[PDB]
Amino acid sequence: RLTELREDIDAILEDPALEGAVSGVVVVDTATGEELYSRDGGEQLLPASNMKLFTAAAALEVLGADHSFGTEVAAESAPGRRGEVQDLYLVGRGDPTLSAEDLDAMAAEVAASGVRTVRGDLYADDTWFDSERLVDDWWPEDEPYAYSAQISALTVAHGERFDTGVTEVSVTPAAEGEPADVDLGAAEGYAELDNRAVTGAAGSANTLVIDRPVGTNTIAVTGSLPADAAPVTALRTVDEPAALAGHLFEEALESNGVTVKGDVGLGGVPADWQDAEVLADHTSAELSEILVPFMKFSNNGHAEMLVKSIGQETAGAGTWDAGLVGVEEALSGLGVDTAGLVLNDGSGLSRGNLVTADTVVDLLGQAGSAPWAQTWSASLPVAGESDPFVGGTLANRMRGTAAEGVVEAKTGTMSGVSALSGYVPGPEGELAFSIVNNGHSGPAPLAVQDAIAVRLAEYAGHQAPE
Ligand SMILES: *[B-](O)(O)[C@@H](C)NS(C)(=O)=O
Numbered sequence: 359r360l361t362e363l364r365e366d367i368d369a370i371l372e373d374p375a376l377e378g379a380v381s382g383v384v385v386v387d388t389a390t391g392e393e394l395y396s397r398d399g400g401e402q403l404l405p406a407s408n409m410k411l412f413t414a415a416a417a418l419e420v421l422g423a424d425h426s427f428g429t430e431v432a433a434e435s436a437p438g439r440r441g442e443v444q445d446l447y448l449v450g451r452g453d454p455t456l457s458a459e460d461l462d463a464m465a466a467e468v469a470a471s472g473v474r475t476v477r478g479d480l481y482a483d484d485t486w487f488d489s490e491r492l493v494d495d496w497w498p499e500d501e502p503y504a505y506s507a508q509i510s511a512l513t514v515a516h517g518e519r520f521d522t523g524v525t526e527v528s529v530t531p532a533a534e535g536e537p538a539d540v541d542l543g544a545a546e547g548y549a550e551l552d553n554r555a556v557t558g559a560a561g562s563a564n565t566l567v568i569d570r571p572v573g574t575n576t577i578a579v580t581g582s583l584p585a586d587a588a589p590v591t592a593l594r595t596v597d598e599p600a601a602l603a604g605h606l607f608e609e610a611l612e613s614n615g616v617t618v619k620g621d622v623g624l625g626g627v628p629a630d631w632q633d634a635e636v637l638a639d640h641t642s643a644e645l646s647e648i649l650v651p652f653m654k655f656s657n658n659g660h661a662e663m664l665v666k667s668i669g670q671e672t673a674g675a676g677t678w679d680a681g682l683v684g685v686e687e688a689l690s691g692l693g694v695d696t697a698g699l700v701l702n703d704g705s706g707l708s709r710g711n712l713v714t715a716d717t718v719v720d721l722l723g724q725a726g727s728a729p730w731a732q733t734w735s736a737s738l739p740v741a742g743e744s745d746p747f748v749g750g751t752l753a754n755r756m757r758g759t760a761a762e763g764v765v766e767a768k769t770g771t772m773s774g775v776s777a778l779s780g781y782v783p784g785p786e787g788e789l790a791f792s793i794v795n796n797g798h799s800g801p802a803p804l805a806v807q808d809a810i811a812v813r814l815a816e817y818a819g820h821q822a823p824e
Pocket residue numbers: 406407408505506656658705706707769770771772773
């Protein structure tokens with residue numbers, strides 16, 4: 359034993375997929391502190407979504423398991439007799455889990471506090487973070503999509519997954535030759551529609567494109583949708599998230615019995631306002647439980663929002679420059695050697711990132727003994743588990759294997775980058791492992807990742823369900 363593990367993993371790393379790829383592979387037995395397996399442990403590689411490990415362990419350190427985010431709506435005075443306020447300010451403070459149901463409940467409170475007429479304009483105050491929406495090196499072709507959604511203090515989160523800065527577009531088909539019905543979701547009335555899509559014949563080619571062209575707030579829909587096709591739904595981003603949350607809170611007040619007389623725009627509570635009257639407040643879930651949808655489904659928006667939030671705790675600045683340092687700081691303070699690291703964002707979306715595998719293993723050992731260990735461990739995706747909120751990105755992976763409901767790891771994935779790091783808690787020692795793969799030519803070496811992980815599940819003393 360022990361040497362067998364070497365041959366097994368050595369052989370797994372011979373696949374034709376590893377033509378001209380660099381692969382960092384580090385396995386350590388937490389209990390003994392034994393270096394089970396190490397190959398290119400110090401080599402510097404792009405982590406992709408394994409950067410979320412760092413951002414998450416750091417959000418814990420800096421923000422606390424119990425940290426919650428609050429939204430506030432302000433006017434310059436309380437409503438009196440006539441139930442009239444002037445300008446109304448929707449003031450967000452870094453809430454990643456902010457639904458339209460919450461804006462309703464805040465619009466409910468605005469009415470019940472006595473406002474009936476917002477005589478001035480309704481304003482969106484997301485000044486809590488900087489107005490820098492996208493990291494330096496993200497791609498303009500990524501912009502339209504949930505993972506490249508803009509970063510704001512005031513964002514509307516969709517679904518129970520809390521996908522920020524996006525509206526769900528719906529394209530139901532109609533009759534052959536007729537244009538299809540496009541439904542812009544929450545951003546109805548905020549975003550432009552450029553519907554050029556047509557309903558095609560029955561069982562015909564599906565070539566439907568839902569896009570938002572760069573630097574525009576226009577949802578340009580193209581292509582064709584069959585008459586028989588299952589109605590389509592897809593997440594697209596808006597320009598200026600808070601301006602949408604503005605528009606949506608607009609609708610809420612109109613609904614809750616409040617006439618709004620002026621325009622909706624971006625704006626920060628003016629400095630001349632002395633003693634503001636806060637008409638509605640809200641409170642998110644505690645971070646620890648926000649970690650779940652964030653880590654399970656690999657939420658980018660959450661990652662960056664948390665960073666910039668980290669930049670507010672330590673520096674008073676909703677800024678990447680501010681939070682990234684703070685992140686690096688916390689991990690250092692966690693017992694982590696930051697020699698190998700290079701941080702250009704929270705999510706791992708930036709190609710400006712670098713990690714080594716020894717560094718990830720380093721992180722994992724440290725975080726494991728942290729007073730926040732178990733909610734961190736929990737937030738991580740679990741192998742082969744049908745439940746999305748438990749499976750995460752490992753739901754359809756390693757099913758019916760020694761790694762099923764066992765391996766707690768996190769995945770990292772983008773063009774020519776693939777990664778798996780985490781815990782294999784076995785009877786023969788809680789294993790922590792990292793596998794980082796860069797610059798492969800053909801398919802994703804997900805098979806080589808699972809293979810390693812399943813074998814490690816077996817070494818730990820597990821066996822495949824039958
Ligand atoms: B992560 O889940 O690898 C994330 C960065 N992936 S991506 C490229 O935004 O889809």
